[PDB]
Design a protein around this ligand. Sequence first.
Ligand SMILES: [Ca+2]
Ligand SMILES: [Ca+2]
Lengths: 228, 230
Amino acid sequence: SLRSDLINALYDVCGIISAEGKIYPLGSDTKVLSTIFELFSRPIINKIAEKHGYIVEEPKQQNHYPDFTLYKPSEPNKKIAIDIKATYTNKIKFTLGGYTSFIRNNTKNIVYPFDQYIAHWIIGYVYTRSLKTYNINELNEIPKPYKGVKVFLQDKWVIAGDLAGSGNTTNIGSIHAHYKDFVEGKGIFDSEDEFLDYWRNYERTSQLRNDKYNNISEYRNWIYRGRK
Amino acid sequence: LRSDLINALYDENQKYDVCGIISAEGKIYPLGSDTKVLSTIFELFSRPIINKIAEKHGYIVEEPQQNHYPDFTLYKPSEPNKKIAIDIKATYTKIKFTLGGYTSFIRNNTKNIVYPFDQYIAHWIIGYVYTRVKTYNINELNEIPKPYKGVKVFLQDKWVIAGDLAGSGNTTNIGSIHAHYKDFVEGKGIFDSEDEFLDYWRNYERTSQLRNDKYNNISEYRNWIYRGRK
DNA sequence: AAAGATATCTT
DNA sequence: AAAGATATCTT
Ligand SMILES: [Ca+2]
Ligand SMILES: [Ca+2]
């Protein structure tokens, strides 16, 4: 299938190269990598989609989820969203998007209405942590600022957690497990419906959550009480 | 340092473009449409120059560790106490920049800054201004499609191009003047001094409400000051 | 944790 | 505007 091939396809940057052949090495910022990984998945996401007859689309306008929207023109409401993410192993975790945007307002901050996607994949890259230029002839001497990239493709609701991944930028956090857990799909939600209900009703600050729920158990008890 | 720094950036930029990332196996990947990527790609490009010019003048240059301003710190070991902060920025085409938070180091000397705020005597913004616009190989490189066009660069003191409105809400950022690239190079800002910059941003409220009674702009700040900050 | 930094875009 | 999205990271 589209999913199996993609996973199959997905299984080392030297730096930015300028049109004059000079190569600037990467820096220590963890920022540079997340984007680097998108650039690396791009060709693959595309060759596989095409092979399967999907069209790929990236956001045109800013502040929009997801990195890649795959779909057939024939099946407009069976859209697939793919989001590239990465973090360094130091048990790993991810921020998985806002809980106050599109999941609460179907058309807020998403390239296509949320009800139009029937899958939300996360391709996660996991990795391990000279100020001069080089030429192609000396690629072998350029310092890599990370090693052991490992990746997995996995449905989002599956690895989603019950703790927010950020504060002022209200992000859903993922489970705080081992790479094998994301791959294997060991999560905490019974279903996607639960995943969504939990995050659609999550409050922003603890102060508002203490009177409602702050974890999956408390939420389930919250349902029992009558969502009151 | 300053004059040398810009001459270098001006010349190299008017003669060099980034085409994409390159792998350990020679495979070149074209850049993306992500605006946010460019702000870092220009940083990488700038590192060699900065290090080089700084080296001529006897400055040691340092980068931080996660969530710490600034991108580059320059100081002479014989004069550690006089640091130069350099923050790379970038944006597309009037232009506006977000110039960092107004609740970290400007209010608390050591919060989210590589060295105490009071150890720096200059904070320079090197701004990159551009216009928005397969797996390649070196011998193809010249014809790889870029996502920007007409990159310009200025080097200016931060307090100079700093504005009197927030550059962000939830993340409490200082916003620059919303002006043309020329006003940035010439320094046609709104603050009279650096202290008027510091004071204004240190007493600025996070919400319109709180400001409603205090001051929401440079004129109001100045009237506020006249009365004795009342 | 849980809140708020880092940084940039947007109505 | 001003406030709240896109992200990821650390206190
Ligand atoms: Ca930096
Ligand atoms: Ca910067």
